[PDB]
Amino acid sequence: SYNPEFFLYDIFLKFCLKYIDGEICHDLFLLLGKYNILPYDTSNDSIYACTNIKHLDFINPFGVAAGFDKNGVCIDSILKLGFSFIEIGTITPRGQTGNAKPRIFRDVESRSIINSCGFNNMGCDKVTENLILFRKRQEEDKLLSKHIVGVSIGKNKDTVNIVDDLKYCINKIGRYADYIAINVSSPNEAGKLKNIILSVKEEIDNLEKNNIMNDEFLWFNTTKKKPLVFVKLAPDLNQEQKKEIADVLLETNIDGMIISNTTTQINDIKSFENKKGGVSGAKLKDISTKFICEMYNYTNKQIPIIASGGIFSGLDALEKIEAGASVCQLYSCLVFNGMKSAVQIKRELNHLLYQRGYYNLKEAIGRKHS
Ligand SMILES: Cc1cc2nc3c(=O)[nH]c(=O)nc-3n(C[C@H](O)[C@H](O)[C@H](O)COP(=O)(O)O)c2cc1C
Ligand SMILES: Cc1cc(Nc2ccc3ccccc3c2)[n+]2[nH]c[nH+]c2n1
Ligand SMILES: CCCCCCCCCCCC[N+](C)(C)[O-]
Ligand SMILES: O=C(O)c1cc(=O)[nH]c(=O)[nH]1
């Protein structure tokens, strides 16, 4: 509104939404970020809305979800919109072109998206080089100081074993990540998951084990510690599957769970009737929130939750927090609300936390459970 850089951008984004293909719009804004002409949020975040996952400390509770910057080409400018963190990827060991275009469609009226990108990415080696270059800029760029970068990692479509795909990614990019997100949930048994999770924690342990450098020099990342390990879960699961996965997460000592990925359970979006892929945005909100409550329960409140999505407003964020989330990720909100998304949502959450009588954010976590 009053700030002109954000105002001009959000008129422009309105135009793009109306006229221009979604993926094209995405790439255009990625390109504007790469050349550093997006607005900055240079305001101090409220100390009462800080949050953490184990010893990973978030300056504010809002990050950007995976799939947004698949190749880490725009990390600086996206963070500087006011986010405390970003999950780049999903990356795979070798590059993949993804499914035929067009493959991202928006329904403005329901503020929802469907996609069948199919894990398009430049591959691990190139993204690692992109993240390295980010880490070097981060040493020089004051507004990036304590900002977190996680890396989502996945299997190549046709792989000979999932485990070794993940190990290759870890070995390449692990030193530059603050956390690693295991994405084995995506459109486009549980003993298999246990072995995946254990193989990942082991490869990270092995980076530590057999590098001769002190941690200051091995971990070229924000925390200067080894990356935490999270898993991202798809919401299209039966109650038994959820219970089983909960057990695996408890047993492997996973650092956190990202709940949730996109859903294929949505049938009532008119403009999407011909379309396949997973649905994001407002129509996912209730499903994701229900799923957070369930996994919070099934894991005995022992596993920190990263919420995603249908998160647009301060209210949406608080719902996720009170359902059990420690931190929130946005994707669709950036598509529909533009450059101002983080500024506006942080303010709305702050005002809401106060109205509800909460001293801080951490106080609200899980509060809907009695
Ligand atoms: C175009 C598109 C691509 C995505 N790619 C990924 C992906 O690479 N890895 C992943 O874990 N999630 C991916 N997601 C899912 C998002 O990370 C997020 O979980 C989902 O959009 C729900 O959040 P939202 O309702 O705020 O959009 C993608 C979503 C969309 C819209
Ligand atoms: C208009 C639009 C934008 C967009 N993506 C955006 C939005 C905001 C961004 C901010 C910074 C950097 C990149 C960004 C990309 N999409 N995505 C899929 N449809 C679509 N339509
Ligand atoms: C108060 C200064 C601390 C002393 C500096 C020494 C750094 C040691 C931390 C790096 C750990 C190396 N190691 C054992 C994990 O492989
Ligand atoms: O690349 C994709 O198609 C994709 C990955 C994912 O994890 N979620 C999603 O909705 N799409």
Side-chain angles (χ1 to χ4, degrees):
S1 282
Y2 225 88
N3 180 323
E5 297 176 25
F6 287 95
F7 188 70
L8 269 47
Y9 262 104
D10 297 320
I11 290 168
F12 184 68
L13 186 127
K14 266 209 266 268
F15 170 96
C16 293
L17 264 167
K18 180 183 181 60
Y19 294 116
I20 312 293
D21 166 75
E23 187 147 10
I24 289 293
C25 283
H26 197 77
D27 295 347
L28 168 63
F29 290 118
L30 289 176
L31 170 65
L32 297 175
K34 182 175 165 179
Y35 291 89
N36 193 215
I37 56 174
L38 302 183
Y40 295 171
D41 179 1
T42 60
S43 292
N44 288 315
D45 297 314
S46 167
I47 61 172
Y48 305 111
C50 290
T51 191
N52 69 292
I53 289 175
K54 311 205 162 180
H55 300 289
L56 191 64
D57 289 330
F58 294 95
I59 59 176
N60 73 60
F62 297 104
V64 170
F68 206 92
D69 194 353
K70 272 172 189 280
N71 301 309
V73 302
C74 196
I75 299 159
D76 285 338
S77 291
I78 292 172
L79 285 178
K80 291 187 288 199
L81 292 174
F83 294 99
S84 57
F85 76 111
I86 182 172
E87 195 173 301
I88 65 167
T90 297
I91 64 157
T92 54
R94 296 305 165 214
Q96 293 184 162
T97 47
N99 298 326
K101 290 171 185 200
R103 58 202 176 176
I104 307 160
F105 305 89
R106 304 151 293 192
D107 192 72
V108 170
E109 193 62 349
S110 69
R111 295 175 305 156
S112 298
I113 302 173
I114 182 153
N115 82 85
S116 65
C117 294
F119 296 88
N120 53 303
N121 72 103
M122 298 171 327
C124 183
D125 296 3
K126 182 62 202 209
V127 179
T128 300
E129 172 203 325
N130 288 342
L131 186 55
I132 283 167
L133 292 166
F134 168 77
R135 292 301 190 182
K136 294 185 169 167
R137 289 172 232 125
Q138 177 185 35
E139 300 179 309
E140 286 168 288
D141 182 348
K142 193 187 322 218
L143 297 170
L144 295 174
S145 157
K146 288 170 175 175
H147 294 240
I148 298 313
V149 184
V151 188
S152 190
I153 65 174
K155 67 174 191 85
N156 272 118
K157 271 139 176 186
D158 58 2
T159 194
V160 316
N161 68 309
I162 306 148
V163 161
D164 265 20
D165 274 14
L166 306 179
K167 312 276 229 161
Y168 180 87
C169 291
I170 293 166
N171 289 151
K172 268 303 200 155
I173 212 165
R175 288 184 61 212
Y176 313 109
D178 295 309
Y179 75 78
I180 295 281
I182 297 164
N183 192 8
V184 284
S185 70
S186 147
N188 314 329
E189 63 185 342
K192 267 168 179 162
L193 187 60
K194 195 175 294 151
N195 184 54
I196 278 152
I197 295 170
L198 290 181
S199 289
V200 166
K201 298 180 77 146
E202 276 171 34
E203 260 288 25
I204 288 155
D205 285 348
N206 294 357
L207 282 171
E208 186 69 42
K209 282 207 212 304
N210 60 62
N211 203 282
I212 69 166
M213 302 301 280
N214 280 327
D215 285 348
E216 167 86 348
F217 308 93
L218 166 60
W219 305 115
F220 197 32
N221 62 7
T222 300
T223 60
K224 310 303 275 179
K225 307 177 329 149
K226 57 197 183 164
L228 302 195
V229 175
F230 304 159
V231 68
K232 187 164 181 184
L233 308 165
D236 310 333
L237 295 167
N238 65 54
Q239 295 297 331
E240 176 55 30
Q241 291 169 304
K242 292 168 188 180
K243 285 180 202 164
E244 276 169 31
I245 287 159
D247 287 336
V248 174
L249 304 185
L250 293 155
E251 288 163 20
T252 61
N253 223 259
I254 205 91
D255 297 309
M257 52 196 170
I258 308 150
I259 302 175
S260 61
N261 213 315
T262 54
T263 185
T264 55
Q265 281 189 308
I266 291 164
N267 279 238
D268 43 35
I269 302 175
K270 338 78 225 176
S271 69
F272 293 165
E273 69 189 332
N274 41 344
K275 308 290 162 46
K276 210 42 223 159
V279 172
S280 306
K283 282 230 152 181
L284 171 63
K285 183 168 69 212
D286 295 330
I287 287 158
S288 160
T289 298
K290 178 199 92 287
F291 192 21
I292 291 170
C293 290
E294 295 166 356
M295 293 307 288
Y296 194 51
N297 280 339
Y298 299 153
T299 55
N300 317 299
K301 312 178 174 189
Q302 296 291 301
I303 312 286
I305 296 171
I306 299 78
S308 178
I311 307 165
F312 293 86
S313 65
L315 188 68
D316 302 329
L318 186 56
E319 296 179 8
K320 305 284 179 182
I321 292 156
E322 289 179 354
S326 281
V327 211
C328 294
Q329 285 179 330
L330 308 187
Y331 197 127
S332 291
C333 188
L334 278 159
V335 171
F336 298 104
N337 302 343
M339 298 312 156
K340 70 181 183 296
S341 289
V343 173
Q344 168 180 131
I345 205 172
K346 288 185 296 185
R347 285 181 188 167
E348 291 175 0
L349 181 55
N350 287 347
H351 294 196
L352 204 57
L353 284 174
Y354 179 86
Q355 281 169 19
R356 303 283 165 110
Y358 282 112
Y359 171 86
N360 61 22
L361 178 155
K362 297 175 216 215
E363 196 164 288
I365 307 175
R367 191 99 150 202
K368 221 66 208 301
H369 298 57
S370 174

Coordinates of all heavy atoms in Angstrom, one line a residue, residues 45 113 125 154 263:
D45 N 12.3 -8.3 12.8 CA 11.2 -9.2 13.2 C 11.1 -9.2 14.7 O 12.0 -9.0 15.4 CB 11.5 -10.6 12.6 CG 11.6 -10.7 11.1 OD1 10.7 -10.1 10.5 OD2 12.5 -11.2 10.6
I113 N -3.8 -24.0 -6.7 CA -2.9 -24.3 -7.8 C -2.9 -25.8 -8.0 O -3.1 -26.6 -7.1 CB -1.4 -23.8 -7.6 CG1 -1.4 -22.3 -7.3 CG2 -0.5 -24.2 -8.7 CD1 -0.1 -21.7 -6.9
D125 N 24.8 -31.5 -9.0 CA 26.1 -30.8 -9.2 C 25.9 -29.3 -9.5 O 26.7 -28.5 -9.0 CB 26.9 -31.4 -10.3 CG 27.3 -32.8 -10.0 OD1 26.9 -33.4 -9.0 OD2 28.1 -33.4 -10.9
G154 N 15.6 -35.7 -3.7 CA 14.7 -36.8 -4.1 C 15.4 -37.8 -5.1 O 16.6 -37.6 -5.4
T263 N -2.1 -32.4 -2.6 CA -3.1 -33.4 -2.6 C -3.7 -33.7 -3.9 O -3.9 -32.8 -4.7 CB -4.1 -33.2 -1.5 OG1 -5.0 -34.3 -1.4 CG2 -5.0 -32.0 -1.8

